[PDB]
Design a protein around this ligand. Sequence first.
Ligand code: MG
Ligand code: MG
Ligand code: MG
Ligand code: MG
Ligand code: MG
Ligand code: MG
Ligand code: MG
Ligand code: MG
Ligand code: MG
Ligand code: MG
Ligand code: MG
Ligand code: MG
Ligand code: MG
Ligand code: MG
Ligand code: MG
Ligand code: MG
Ligand code: MG
Ligand code: MG
Ligand code: MG
Ligand code: MG
Ligand code: MG
Ligand code: MG
Ligand code: MG
Ligand code: MG
Ligand code: MG
Ligand code: MG
Ligand code: MG
Ligand code: MG
Ligand code: ZN
Lengths: 60, 129, 86, 155, 104, 232
Amino acid sequence: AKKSLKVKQTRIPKFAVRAYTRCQRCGRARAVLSHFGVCRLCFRELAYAGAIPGVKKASW
Amino acid sequence: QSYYGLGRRKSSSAKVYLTPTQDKGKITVNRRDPSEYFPNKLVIQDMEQPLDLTDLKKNFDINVVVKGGGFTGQAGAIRLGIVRALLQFNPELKKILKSKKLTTRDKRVKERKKFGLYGARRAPQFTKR
Amino acid sequence: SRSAKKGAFVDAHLLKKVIDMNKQEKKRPIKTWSRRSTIFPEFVGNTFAVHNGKTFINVYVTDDMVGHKLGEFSPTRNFKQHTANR
Amino acid sequence: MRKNRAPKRTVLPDPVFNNTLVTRIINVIMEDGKKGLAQRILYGAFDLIEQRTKEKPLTVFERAVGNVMPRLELRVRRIAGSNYQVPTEVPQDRKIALALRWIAMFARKRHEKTMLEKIANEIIDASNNTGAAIKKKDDTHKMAEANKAFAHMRW
Amino acid sequence: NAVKYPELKIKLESYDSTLLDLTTKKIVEVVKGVDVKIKGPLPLPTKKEVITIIRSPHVDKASREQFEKNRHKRLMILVDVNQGAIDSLKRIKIPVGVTLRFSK
Amino acid sequence: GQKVNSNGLRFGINKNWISRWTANSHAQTAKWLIEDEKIRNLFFVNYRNAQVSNVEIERTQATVDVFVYAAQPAFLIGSENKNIQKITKQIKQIIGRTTNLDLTINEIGSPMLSARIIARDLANAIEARVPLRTAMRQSLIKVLKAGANGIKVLVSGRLNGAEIARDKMYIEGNMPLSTLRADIDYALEKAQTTYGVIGVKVWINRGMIYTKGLNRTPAHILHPQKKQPNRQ
RNA sequence: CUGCUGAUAAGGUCUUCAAAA
RNA sequence: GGUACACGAAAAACCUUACCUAGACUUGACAUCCUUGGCAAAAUUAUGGAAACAUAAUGGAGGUUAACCGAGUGACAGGUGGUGCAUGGUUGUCGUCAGCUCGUGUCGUGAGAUGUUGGGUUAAGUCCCGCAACGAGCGCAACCCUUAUCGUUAGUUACAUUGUCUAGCGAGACUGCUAAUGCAAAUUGGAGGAAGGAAGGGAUGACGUCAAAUCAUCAUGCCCCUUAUGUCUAGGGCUGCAAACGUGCUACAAUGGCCAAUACAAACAGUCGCCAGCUUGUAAAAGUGAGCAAAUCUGUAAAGUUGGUCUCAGUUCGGAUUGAGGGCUGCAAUUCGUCCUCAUGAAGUCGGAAUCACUAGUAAUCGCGAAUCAGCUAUGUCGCGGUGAAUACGUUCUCG
Ligand SMILES: [Mg+2]
Ligand SMILES: [Mg+2]
Ligand SMILES: [Mg+2]
Ligand SMILES: [Mg+2]
Ligand SMILES: [Mg+2]
Ligand SMILES: [Mg+2]
Ligand SMILES: [Mg+2]
Ligand SMILES: [Mg+2]
Ligand SMILES: [Mg+2]
Ligand SMILES: [Mg+2]
Ligand SMILES: [Mg+2]
Ligand SMILES: [Mg+2]
Ligand SMILES: [Mg+2]
Ligand SMILES: [Mg+2]
Ligand SMILES: [Mg+2]
Ligand SMILES: [Mg+2]
Ligand SMILES: [Mg+2]
Ligand SMILES: [Mg+2]
Ligand SMILES: [Mg+2]
Ligand SMILES: [Mg+2]
Ligand SMILES: [Mg+2]
Ligand SMILES: [Mg+2]
Ligand SMILES: [Mg+2]
Ligand SMILES: [Mg+2]
Ligand SMILES: [Mg+2]
Ligand SMILES: [Mg+2]
Ligand SMILES: [Mg+2]
Ligand SMILES: [Mg+2]
Ligand SMILES: [Zn+2]
């Protein structure tokens, strides 16, 4: 069960606290970056592909 | 003829103003008595270390501005500032100051914490069984 | 714990059912799933069947149980005895 | 399997009595990185020494550390069963370090009141060759003298 | 002569640094080509955001990498501009990465 | 062991970003980050016969600009500009009719030394049941004849339909992967074979970048003319 | 410089190919 | 096992959720292809209802069907179902250790050898000599970021005790000079220098081993289900409990407990937010209410200093557990949130055999911030600063 959960997440619930943030590219529920709306394992791929502007590897 | 020095330590800047005076040095930090600014935990001798062995009878009026760090870092910063301002008065002190190495930035700063480690260098407990 | 200005809480479907069954003389068990509802004074005298998770356990409220939560008088997991591993 | 000898940091002279051993014992009684607290403990103990012995605190401290300061060390070397010990002459720096470490360890265990008085009385007792660090030094010295035979073989 | 815009405080910010310097260079060049007294292109502290992401798909949280995003920021305040400078400013075409926060 | 992505290690130092925009809020940052992914995935998975090397996306508050570098843009153009309108409507449906689209096709010069299209050709040959040794040998020899530095090709998976997975590598020329100054283009593709999935990863070395800067310059599109239109 | 120091269930992948470019 | 056990999970009350019980659905909650019309879907109000869903309402943006709203319709959708021993991708480990190979040549009937071994020097298969070998590739090093001194550019929202500070560019350190010895690489000492001989830290991780981990991020071969292993909802569960282990927090205390006054940070974050001030309250907080889209406003720094008190006791230590009254978030706090106040006051007085981490701003210790987040006994994770140690004689032993 993933397609139904994705569709239900897009659909608005009847309570405000019912709403949770899923990844927009994949459907992963846990470990989602609200700054980018993308889970960690897809954020890594996008950053390595250069899709997210300004996200360079950090050396500190 | 005033002298200006800029010292730094542990991310704590210092601006030391040396004024020629002959009515006691009267060291002063950030418009406050050093005995009240510092915990007076004898750290005063730390900043006077380069001004003791050579001289303070010359009664330099000290105007110190420090913004940042704790108190040991501030003391080290004003020590470096006093030395660097002293390099502007009779550069012959430069040799003696270099001899005991009070004219070099300490370069020691806190390391960055690393992931998977409980700190800069500490590591988690290791279990084998 | 629960705030004062908010007061107590009932789903109000249970409240409507309780009012109706109190006005009716021949009361019967009230099958409810609302374990979140607190036992209001008007509840006194009725009998409820609360969904423990599997079945509906019957609880008879009294003038004393007033205040607690309705599902607090029914359990959800059962444990009675371990077994020796070795 | 290191083939490198470690460097040594400066000991720093004490800014009150101008005796490096004072700074060393401050660092030894350091706990939780509290230089101020350690310095307060030491200077209060020295003032109590003034109040009691009526002599120079630095001289009393030197008389205590020199007397507690050991001569021989026994290094454990196991071959087949248990360990046979080996007496070796220690360097002066490690000698002083061991003396200070023993002084602090036996000072933080005595039955008395605040650690100020604890360490002060421990120092005054060790100044007269009667103390717990004295007993420790005596024990290691007697053990080395007993195991004097295996001194020739070290490794 | 008129001004119609006193104290035009242009604020620049971008994820990239060199593009920001180039855009500020073009801006100051145009505004000095017109008769306007630029206060100066000063820099402001760069807000750096760090995101830490576990490399592995399933386990080994210990092995994790890091990413950064810097919002480089510059300030530049013009005293009096007038139409003679505003019309020339209209044709600047700042690159997309640069962001303007004009405050009038 | 495991190696960091060659592109990801060099991004932000000697490589510019494929999408250049600044969003308004966190809500819009996700939508804009997903729409560009959809557009790029469209251009890559379908209309594959045109050898689209790379597509860059450039957005402002409301205007979308797409730069599609292709080796054979005649297939995108179609017969008297037919498929152009189809892909334009596809993009407009993807992003929204409220925005203004500025699609721009660009003929890429010296295509052969581009890892994306080399890997795509590799995957097509694998899927077409072409023998692997011959396929990799011909691809390597044509890449080298194109006049570049070393190229490293790694092809892993259920090799030739075997029940045990293997991997086959061909390096021919110097490929310094630890060096940051080197211009290394890396691409990865999946050949969907009747026996499963084959992963082809192509690293190509294209000299050393001796000019400091975040690119802002074309990368092997310049040897011939790079001027194709469809814009405004 | 010779203390002591014993054992580890069965069957198993993994090279398809050079004909050639 | 090392390479699992504060791990996936950077947030389990509902949702998450994949599990159980129950109430409901069938080209389906979602999608394409086809014959076909668009004059809807939402949302909300009624009744039945645990809610799913049903009967009635306002019949709705729009743009004539664009997207979507439908009818018919069979291919089918759907699966967090199995197989990580069919795979792609990604990752742990040996290990940031210094190795792994190739072309030509030569030796050997052959597997194979040479180069890669030998002597010096390094962290290094780093380099130099020797040498049937001559070269080359990946790895090492450097190029990348940051900290340490300085110059220049700019002076607001920094500074304004006038040159700090912030961020672009640049200079600087190159065994560059000197002495020793070596053929040469090079090693050691000195000078000047902020910095000296990989100046400190980070990113960077070769061929391959463990058929190592993941079909539950994603994709995918094959098998299996197709009015059910697919879908919606309500309740319960993932929080159980004679026990055992791992990782952490708090302690067993006068280097301390409590009370009062009080000084000094960096980094980061903020318009469903940060919340200054004021009023109320023993307090969590409530109301009013400015300021800030931020070098401007907000997010109380604590250890530390001084003073008062306790006077070595199971205590003014220790806070567990337990009863009561309140605050906030949320439809909803019983299973199962956290905070405050009042009251009670378990164990525990330094921990057996045996083990762990650490070589300077390190260990130890004290606070601050952020991510996921409506809320959360995260004491967890990722970062920042304040104070700030001890030791390294040596490789006999121990693991690799
Ligand atoms: Mg799925
Ligand atoms: Mg939630
Ligand atoms: Mg911890
Ligand atoms: Mg153990
Ligand atoms: Mg034995
Ligand atoms: Mg046997
Ligand atoms: Mg649930
Ligand atoms: Mg209509
Ligand atoms: Mg019509
Ligand atoms: Mg495996
Ligand atoms: Mg070898
Ligand atoms: Mg030989
Ligand atoms: Mg050789
Ligand atoms: Mg390197
Ligand atoms: Mg296995
Ligand atoms: Mg594992
Ligand atoms: Mg599956
Ligand atoms: Mg449910
Ligand atoms: Mg759990
Ligand atoms: Mg006290
Ligand atoms: Mg101000
Ligand atoms: Mg306040
Ligand atoms: Mg005090
Ligand atoms: Mg007791
Ligand atoms: Mg207490
Ligand atoms: Mg509760
Ligand atoms: Mg006691
Ligand atoms: Mg080390
Ligand atoms: Zn994702």
